[PDB]
Amino acid sequence: QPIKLARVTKVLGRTGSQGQCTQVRVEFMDDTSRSIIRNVKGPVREGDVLTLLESEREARRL
Amino acid sequence: VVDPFSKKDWYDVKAPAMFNIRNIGKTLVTRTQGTKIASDGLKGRVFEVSLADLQNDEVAFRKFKLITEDVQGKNCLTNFHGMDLTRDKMCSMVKKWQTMIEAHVDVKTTDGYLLRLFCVGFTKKRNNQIRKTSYAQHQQVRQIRKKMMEIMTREVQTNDLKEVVNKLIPDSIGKDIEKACQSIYPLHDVFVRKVKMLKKPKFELGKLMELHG
Amino acid sequence: SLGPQVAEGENVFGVCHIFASFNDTFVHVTDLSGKETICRVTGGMKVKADRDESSPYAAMLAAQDVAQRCKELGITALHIKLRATGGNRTKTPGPGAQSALRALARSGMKIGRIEDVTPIPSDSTRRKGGRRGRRL
Amino acid sequence: MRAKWRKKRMRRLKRKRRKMRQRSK
Amino acid sequence: TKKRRNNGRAKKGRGHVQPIRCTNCACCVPKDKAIKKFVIRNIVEAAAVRDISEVSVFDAYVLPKLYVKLHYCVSCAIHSKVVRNRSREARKDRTPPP
RNA sequence: CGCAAGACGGACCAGAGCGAAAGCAUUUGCCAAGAAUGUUUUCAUUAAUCAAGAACGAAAGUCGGAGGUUCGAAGACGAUCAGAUACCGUCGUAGUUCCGACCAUAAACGAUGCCGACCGGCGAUGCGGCGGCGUUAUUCCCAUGACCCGCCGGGCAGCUUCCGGGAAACCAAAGUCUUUGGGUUCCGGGGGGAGUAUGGUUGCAAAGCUGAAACUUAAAGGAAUUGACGGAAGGGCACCACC
RNA sequence: CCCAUGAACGAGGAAUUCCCAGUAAGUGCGGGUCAUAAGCUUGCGUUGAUUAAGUCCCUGCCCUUUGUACACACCGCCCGU
RNA sequence: UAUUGGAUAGGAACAGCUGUACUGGGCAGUUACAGCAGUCGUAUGGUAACACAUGCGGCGUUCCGAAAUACCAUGCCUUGAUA
């Protein structure tokens, strides 16, 4: 099984219960065409990298 | 503890020889061990296979049911069984502010292949029409449906089972209805949408080899 | 496991009956006939929670084991046949259809012609619920 | 009290009376 | 008082219509009363369509849609936020939002 | 892949049609009926509304026969819960279906009697008739079918007006009303006690129709206004809130 | 002020308070009270962080619709054995 | 090159009531605790039997394998005490 990366290309606001999950449009580093939407815990500026432990799950948008 | 997928022999299923594509694909059945024979095992199977899989460059919204009537040793000889229109095109044609006109007939060929043909047809908005609702009155529907029954029984009673499938591969029946029923009320999406073989005569392999030769 | 097929200009086609209801997901794979089957893996064989047999996580594990199993016997393309609960119940495919279909192709499978074959009743029998329905 | 249920209680009262008055016949 | 001129339904010269069931509940609602939708939705909307039409056999395959007509009772259509409470004057508007 | 039996008539299906109302939707045939329309046809007041009386009257329910798959009063259990003989879930009997009798009620609603007269527009819609550029099919042109632009009549309705009315909400009728009178049937008289008691009558039953009084009580009520409130929606905000 | 005595208490259950930068927290010093006098209160400096730049999920607040049999206004009103 | 394998380590749902903390307040459940109901052993009184009293002490419970549990509803009511 792989552990993959993804760079933050655009921020999409803030979700969760208490307003804690940042919804983010991430771009993969295998294909620079393949994008998914991801929920992130913790402070995120636009143009940093995340470690995806499963590269399959795509989150519920709004 | 045993391995079930060792006793599985593959057979290349072949469409009848009135098509452009012959090999449909592979089917597996168990090896002929003891009582249960393989040559009686894969002999009752239907393959719902689209027209894009059978003709050169056709439409993908018409599926043919094909039954295997013979196993010639690593070769199935598939006979014409039925025909169906896909969920997609059938559900795309049915829209509000127009009249849907269905017909059915129970008619046999020159050989004893008793079929059941279903027709559908929808009313057209004219190329300058301003009025929205665009319906047909009951005596206009009854005359269209009467001619739908007439053309279906006409163009199936004349000829045998090859010549009616070759009338369904290009939809020569549905275009006769769309042009014949113009001077009652102009129709736009007219299809023989389902054909359902009811009765079938005693099997002769000599004349299945005509459909596979 | 035994296939005499050359890997030159062939895709050998199975048929994937994906029945995504609102409490489970079936990723059933057959031959072209439908009769002889290869592999079916459900959402409830991947989680130990009756809650999450529905889940979109479990439905992608079902397709990952289906695609692992289908490669060993040697079926490399799929005719998808999507399905809901149907009858006088809901025609909406459940919340783990798009997980079981995403995860199929990305496990090295080839997608053929697709169709939504939910059993639509032309004039059904009386629906379970009663006149005033389900009062939550 | 809902008028249906009030009407249902006056209905059972009158079955009780018709029953208990068919005794004195 | 009388809230709506038509009594929140679309029968004017009948007396009786055929009732139908809801989808989420099975509340047996008259056909002309019910809040009806007809959604024509892609089977795989936009997230998978790249990862499906690139792992398909066929050359430029257009993916088949999912046509379903959904009937709602008034009670649920509000809870599912399909319809809203509207201002007494805004109630009269018949045009749908685009 | 078949097979079997019993219900149901999807999408098309509409602020569309028909019917006295209840109500009525798969194809084809048979049976008898009806509205509107058109008419230089016919009889010549034959009409309108109607105590008593009569026909039809959803669902549930009752009786006898056939049938039973779905659903499902009662019932059994599993959940939930402070208890839950409820809501949720798994089963289920009568019933739900057909035939032949019964009962006669519903928020049986437009909470709005029927027949007739008059009084503003506007765009649609259904049915019949009439007239008129052209497009389209029957090609072999006319009459006809499908569109287009108006007209007339009857009909389900819309939008819109300081007509006018109304306690307002609202209503081209709920108008033409202290400037009160076209004809006529039913029916109300503060809230309860009460559609109760008792007589009579109807029904196999359940119950229906007619139906008081003693006694009690200063309000019950209709429409609109403002505020408060919501286990109502939309938009914001606070470390005396959370993350 | 001195000497002797050397108790519970091993980071505190359910619950719960204050707080986002020289901030919290630690450690002192002034003022008031004061014949005597700071485990208090009000001010001052010193050493100096963690985490957040958010949401309406809890608790509450302000607008707009909406519903109401509430007006000593939901700690309201009210039903039956 | 570690599958295993008892056991004590260690987690859990189970209740006999007041009190405190959940509330603007009340009754319910709910948790943690202490006291004593129950309880076990004990010295005496008493007797042919013996089942209790007295005063003095000890006192959860069953589970036997892990525990990352959504834990919803976090229930209903609200002075005659003066407009």
**Which domain CATH number covers C94?**
3.30.420.80
E28 labeled part of a ligand binding site: no
State whether residue E94 is helix, strand or coil.
coil
Among chain A residues, CA nearest to E50 = A34
- What phi and psi, each to the nearest 5 degrees, are found at residue C53? -70, -35
Q: What CATH number should be reported for the domain holding residue A59?
A: 2.40.50.140
Domain residues for the domain of A58 are 1-62
Identify the residue among C111, C114, C120 best suited for mutation to test binding to E, counting E beta carbons within 10 A and taking the highest: C111
Q: Are E23 and E72 in contact (CB under 8 A)?
A: yes
Nearest chain C CA: its distance from A14 CA (Å)? 23
Chain E nearest CA to B85, separation (Å): 14
Dihedrals φ, ψ of C110, to 5°?
Answer: -110, 125
CB contact A56 to C (< 8 Å): yes
Supply the DSSP string of B122-169, one letter for each residue.
BB---TT---S-----HHHHHHHHHHHHHHHHHHHHSS-HHHHHTTTT
Nearest Cα neighbor of C25 from C78, C102, C113, C88 is: C102
The single-letter code of the amino acid at A24 is: V
CA atoms within 13 A on the CB side of B136: 24
Helix (H) or strand (E) holding B130: none
Name every residue whose Cβ is closer than 8 Å to that of residue C91 and which is 6 or more positions away in sequence: C84, C118, C120, E68
DSSP code at position C53: G
Technique used to solve these coordinates? cryo-EM
Query: Residue E38 CA to nucleotide G7 C1', Å?
Result: 81
Contact C103 A56 (CB under 8 A): yes
Among the listed residues A58, B55, B175, B45, the one whose alpha carbon sits nearest the alpha carbon of residue C99:
A58
Query: B209: closest CA among B46, B49, B69?
Result: B69
Instruction: From residue E56, give the alpha-carbon distance in Å to each of B40, C77, D8, E48, E51.
Output: 35, 9, 68, 12, 9
Q: What share of chain E is helix, strand, coil (3-state, %, to 5)?
A: 15, 20, 65
Q: Please name which of B117, B120, B123 lies closest in space to residue B184, comparing C-alpha atoms.
A: B123
State the nucleotide closest to D17 in CA–C1' terms: F197
Structural domain of C43: 2-136
Q: Give the C-alpha separation, C122 to C69, whole Å.
A: 37
Question: According to the annotation, is E27 in a ligand binding site?
Answer: no
CATH number of the domain that E93 lies in? 3.30.1740.20
The structural domain count of chain A equals: 1
**Mutating which of C11, C15, C17, C32 best tests the B interface, going by the most B Cβ atoms within 10 A?**
C32
Please state at what angle helix C56-73 crosses helix C98-105, rounded to 10 degrees: 40
Give me the domain span that covers residue E29: 1-98
Classify burial at B169, counting beta carbons within 10 Å of its beta carbon; exposed 0-12, middle 13-18, buried 19 or more. middle
Do E22 and C133 make contact, defined as CB atoms within 8 angstroms? yes
Amino acid making up residue B52: A
Q: E strand or H helix at A49, and its extent?
A: strand A49-52
- Interface size, chain A vs chain C, as Cβ–Cβ contacts under 8 Å: 6
Separation of B74 CA and G35 C1' (Å)? 124
* Helix ranges, C33-115 (H): 56-73, 98-105
Q: Which nucleotides of F are covered by protein (CB under 7 A)?
A: 1-2, 6-19, 21-29, 69-73, 87-90, 110-112, 124-128, 134-138, 144-149, 155-160, 169-171, 174, 194-198, 206-207, 222-224, 232-234, 242-243
Rg (CA), chain A: 11
Q: Å resolution of this model?
A: 3.2
